[PDB]
Homo-oligomer: 125 residues x 4
């Protein structure tokens, strides 16, 4: 019932070799799992997020975002990443994102708490 | 059952006068509503996110993040914000965040799709 | 000859206790020194940057930015910070910035190369 | 006399078709011109910046950054971009950056003052 519900739902892979498994709900919900190929991470982590379920029809992408807190049954990296981006449909469908990864720190170390980067997700690798 | 479940759960206010209403689950879930005092927004929007439910005990903050897609029954701003940050407990409890706000754009306009900023949330105003 | 040449030129202090000493040129140049109160840094480092020497007259701030590479005669932290922001004049003059601090890394570690934060500079402390 | 003085100096092109012309000084200076293929920009703009003139010899990139204020003899976009990144040498030499583009705004509009993105520069197109 959301415009790109089918387009977004499924398995995505980024340039680092990480795996993003998501279900898009009719209501705008994103739920799934994230497995990072890098960093202080092992196996799957819960993710949740939101997307625009009624995007513009003028060729614009579909805005979305999601969060992973880096705690699961195996490890806790005392940190959380949020990806903010847009889904672009078509033959080479993509989710183009920028992300913010904040670590829990002391107040004295808060200036160095947050990494920033960019991930591009595709349906194939 | 999460360490800062009680600390995080409730109503928070930022420097712009926005209102963030959240429930923290034992499992690491964040669910609630966001009302922005600024921008192309009216009333409450659904949010979801994650937090570290077993933070370090060395005085470090608690990593968390959440997403709002700016669609509700009143408006659709074809955009999504993610906040990434940490909760700092104590007498003047705070959630210190940085955020990324991505708009759905054409591919030609994607270079100007994403705003970045920083919000500090407190329990009082 | 630039509108805020006099306003910008001088000594500024941020929330971390760092010291930013700058001269604004008529042509839009920023030159000076930066001393960080935190991180892998000691004493003064060269900075250079640019500002809008003919800002809007509608109450808007003055856009500017500058760079420090963290090499001087004492230390080399193999990294560079850029601050991007605006100068806001008046009785409590401020330079409000966001910054990106990139470390030289191997290609395998490039995903974790860049910190992001925000500094507010004032004329007094 | 700087390790990558020769490597950095010259003409670079990004994924948008913008042109970055830079001279790297022995002392860590970057000077040159920037021509954007997009946005409120026409012709060349002055840039200045800094780079690590004595990088690590362990295969790490070379940290650098620079600023453009978007005022020249043709236009004034009341804004400034800073790029923060690293130079990676070799057969396919690259400068991989993230950037912050701040517009001069009123205090009421400062929350929406800053765009963030990422540019990759190469020696060929
Ligand atoms: Cu619409
Ligand atoms: Cu631990
Ligand atoms: Cu004007
Ligand atoms: Cu070294």
């Amino acid at each position: 019932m959301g415009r790109d519900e089918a387009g977004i739902t499924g398995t995505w892979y980024n340039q680092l070799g990480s795996t993003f498994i998501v279900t898009a709900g009719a209501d705008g919900a994103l739920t799934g799992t994230y497995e990072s190929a890098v960093g202080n991470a092992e196996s799957r982590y819960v993710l949740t997020g939101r997307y625009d379920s009624a995007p513009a029809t003028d060729g614009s992408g579909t805005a979305l975002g999601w969060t992973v807190a880096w705690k699961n049954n195996y490890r806790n990296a005392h940190s959380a990443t949020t990806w903010s981006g847009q889904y672009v449909g078509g033959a080479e469908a993509r989710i183009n994102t920028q992300w913010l990864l904040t670590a829990g720190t002391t107040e004295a170390n808060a200036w160095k708490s947050t990494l920033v980067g960019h991930d591009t997700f595709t349906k194939v690798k």
